[PDB]
Amino acid sequence: VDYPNASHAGLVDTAIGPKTTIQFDHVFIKSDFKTWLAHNQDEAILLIRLYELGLLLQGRSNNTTYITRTDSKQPFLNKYGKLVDTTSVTCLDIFLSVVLFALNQIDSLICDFKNVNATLNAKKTIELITCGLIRALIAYANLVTAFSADKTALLHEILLT
Amino acid sequence: VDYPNASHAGLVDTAIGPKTTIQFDHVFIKSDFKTWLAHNQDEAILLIRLYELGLLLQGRSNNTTYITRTDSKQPFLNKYGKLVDTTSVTCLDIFLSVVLFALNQIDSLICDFKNVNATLNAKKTIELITCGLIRALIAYANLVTAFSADKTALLHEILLT
């Protein structure tokens, strides 16, 4: 536990670099936030899909190269690796705020919606939404708690530097 | 905006004390986390109800005075004010972690549950649960993002002290 590289070599978690750390003021720390992003790529991409939705609602909004189609997840796996490559706590703050703005919006929509076959397919719609919003919210609830945990570790390290 | 007390006095948000701030290492900051707790007492108490549930599952677990009944929210409004009176980021971390442990558990239960009148009332049960878990999760998603925001402000202030 204190000498983990010895442990493995007898009886990834020591790899240090941009995809496994965050920093504030060039004070780096091994990042739970990132480690969650590493074990939950599908859910990560889900929050990345919400990040895109959050920018459009606010009104904010290339280099595809191929003249033949390829994969529809291609774009979202590209962004996925730019997120993980990002160590700045200040940039990561932006990301999670935009994403939360989308979660609140989808929820405002559902709540609003709660207050023939069109209707039967319009109910089924909102029910898929609520299903996704659950998953994203537990993904968000878990991701940012880890991000919050990381900061309590950067708060400690700064005071000791 | 820069002189808000003048503004109000012509054309609560400057009150400084334990219920409106958090600190790390006696470095205080005006707290979004707290301000959310101030505008969402019902939802706050909901997360406090989950805090209690989170301790029991882990196995962790008085002074009621009255020999006549009173109110069933009495206990949870007492804890509500101990939370708001708490400025330590390190204590607040505990609280939100315990609460997240409960959210994950309720979700593990629902997922598990997805894989006569007893059954009809047992389905209705899990559906109320999912309804609450939504509300708590958006309450949690919003509360901790604000807590995370607070830390980005404590990270800044420390480096300037």
Author numbering:
A (entry chain A), B (entry chain A): 14 to 24, 33 to 82, 90 to 143, 192 to 237
Quote the authors verbatim.
Viral occlusion bodies (OBs), also called polyhedra, are stable protein crystals that encapsulate newly assembled virions within virus-infected cells. The crystalline polyhedra is formed by repeating units of the ~27.5 kDa ToNV polyhedrin protein, which is predominantly helical, containing ten helices and a short two-stranded antiparallel beta sheet. The ToNV polyhedrin structure is almost completely helical, with a 3D fold not previously observed (to the best of our knowledge). The ToNV polyhedrin achieves the first requirement by forming a dense lattice, free from continuous channels, maintained in all directions by disulfide bonds, hydrophobic and electrostatic interactions, and domain swapping.
During initial analysis of individual crystals of recombinantly expressed polyhedrin, we noted the presence of a crystal population (approximately 10% of crystals which could be indexed) where the unit cell had increased by 3.5 Å in two directions, giving cell dimensions of a = b = 57.2 Å, c = 105.8 Å. Residues 143–191 could not be resolved in the electron density maps, with helix-α9 and the N-terminal region of helix-α10 disordered. The region between helix-α5 and helix-α7 was remodelled and helix-α6 was poorly resolved. At the N-terminus, only helix-α2 remained well resolved while the connecting loops and helix-α1 were not visible. The crystallographic disordering of these polyhedrin residues creates channels within the protein crystals. Whether this crystal form represents an assembly or disassembly intermediate, or an artefact of purification is unclear.
